[PDB]
């Protein structure tokens, strides 16, 4: 289509048509583990890990998330895991990695996605210390666009943080980690996310909506620009007490416009929180701090990234930490058939 052919509204309307087709009729069982060569573990977690793999028939590199069915069950993440796969196989956006393949075997669930060789934003943010406002703004813009997309599909994302933002070969980002994402038109109630990034209404055990994502954006922008988050302590409980008060202090190097944006994102009052008002996302996109961002150019990936990863070949993993490599064991007996029937 032409670059000015459609409004954002029209573009998002057509994107929803595309999404709903796939949402209503999900792809299932589209590869097998023996089609991939396992190269390296890129991350680990409580019920899963992510590996760099090579698809043998194409030589393409992918990230493959491997979930142990029994562990997903023990941790009560069955419905959340079904959500993740159903959503990721249906989405399509420049800053998301949709599923290229998914499948399961007796023991595990597998989701295969475009590989992001730049590593986690977390790694770079901690090492460098903090990002300049233009640098933080460039990342933030991509999240604003991605949330507008996600939210227009009635999706809530619910785990924004630097650990869950992957940097690609051109220095743009991928919003990964859809484990808590959910398609919901009403309010919802699950206590989930990461302590530092939780909106007060989640902590106060209120029903909540997509406004929690916009609060989390405020937390991210603060952390990217300051080098530490707005609410931290050694223990989660102390972090929660800080959030519910919502008292924040800005570094003296923060610009006036940054502070003002953050005051409107980190707003405890839902009737005042940017992203949650009559005008929706446009209150964010039209804020003075974003006055210089070319939303159209960012979407088209036309803007030169402020930081472009070191890249020494298509399956390079130098931007990742090293993790202990564990076997992928497949039982001879089918585990959790019923629970993951639709996967």
């Amino acid at each position: 289509k032409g670059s000015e052919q459609e409004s954002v509204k029209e573009f998002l309307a057509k994107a929803k048509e595309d999404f709903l087709k796939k949402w209503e009729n999900p792809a299932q069982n589209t590869a097998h583990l023996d089609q991939f060569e396992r190269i390296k573990t890129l991350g680990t977690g409580s019920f899963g890990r992510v590996m760099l793999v090579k698809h043998m028939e194409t030589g393409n590199h992918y990230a493959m998330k491997i979930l142990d069915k029994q562990k997903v069950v023990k941790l009560k993440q069955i419905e959340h895991t079904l959500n993740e796969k159903r959503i990721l196989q249906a989405v399509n956006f420049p800053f998301l990695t949709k599923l290229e393949f998914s499948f399961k075997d007796n023991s595990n669930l597998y989701m295969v996605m475009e590989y992001a060789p730049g590593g986690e934003m977390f790694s770079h943010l901690r090492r460098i210390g903090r990002f300049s406002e233009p640098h933080a703004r460039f990342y933030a813009a991509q999240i604003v666009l991605t949330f507008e997309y996600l939210h227009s599909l009635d999706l809530i994302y619910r785990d924004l943080k630097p650990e869950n933002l992957m940097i690609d070969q051109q220095g743009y980002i991928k919003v990964t980690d859809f484990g808590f994402a959910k398609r919901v038109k009403g309010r919802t109630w699950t206590l989930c996310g990461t302590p530092e990034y939780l909106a007060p209404e989640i902590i106060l055990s209120k029903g909540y909506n997509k406004a929690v994502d916009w609060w989390a954006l405020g937390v991210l922008i603060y952390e990217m620009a300051a080098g530490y988050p707005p609410f931290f302590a050694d223990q989660p409980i102390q972090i929660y007490e800080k959030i519910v008060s919502g008292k924040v202090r800005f570094p003296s190097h923060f610009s006036s416009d940054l502070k003002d944006l953050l005051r409107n994102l980190l707003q405890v009052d839902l009737t005042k929180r940017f992203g949650n008002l009559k005008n929706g996302v446009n209150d964010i996109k039209n804020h003075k701090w974003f006055a210089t961002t070319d939303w159209i150019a960012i979407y088209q990936r036309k803007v030169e990234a402020p930081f472009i990863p070191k890249f020494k070949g298509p399956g390079d993993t130098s931007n990742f930490d090293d993790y202990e490599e564990e076997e992928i064991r497949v039982s001879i007996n089918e585990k959790c058939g019923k629970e993951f029937s639709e996967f």
Partner: peptide
């Protein structure tokens, strides 16, 4: 400094999600 207090904290590494 706030930076120093952060770096001395136990939450500068990768943060785990929470779950009810």
């Amino acid at each position: 400094t706030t930076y120093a207090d952060f770096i001395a904290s136990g939450r500068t590494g990768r943060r785990n999600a929470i779950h009810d």
